[PDB]
A and B are shown apart, each in its own frame.
Chain A
Amino acid sequence: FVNQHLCGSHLVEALYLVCGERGGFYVPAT
Chain B
Amino acid sequence: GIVEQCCTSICSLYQLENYCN
Please list the residues of chain A having a beta carbon within 8 angstroms of any beta carbon in chain B.
1, 3-8, 11, 14-15, 18-20, 22, 24-25
Number of interface residues of B (CB under 8 A): 15
The chain B residues found within 8 Å of chain A, CB to CB, are: 2-3, 6-13, 16-17, 19-21
B11 CB to closest chain A CB, in angstroms?
Answer: 7
Docked Cα-Cα span, A10 to B6, in Å, equals 10
Contacts of B8 in A (CB 8 A): 5
Contact B11 A18 (CB under 8 A): no
Q: How far is the CA of A18 from the CA of B13 in the complex (A)?
A: 6
Contact partner of A19 (CB less than 8 A), chosen from B2, B12, B16, is B16
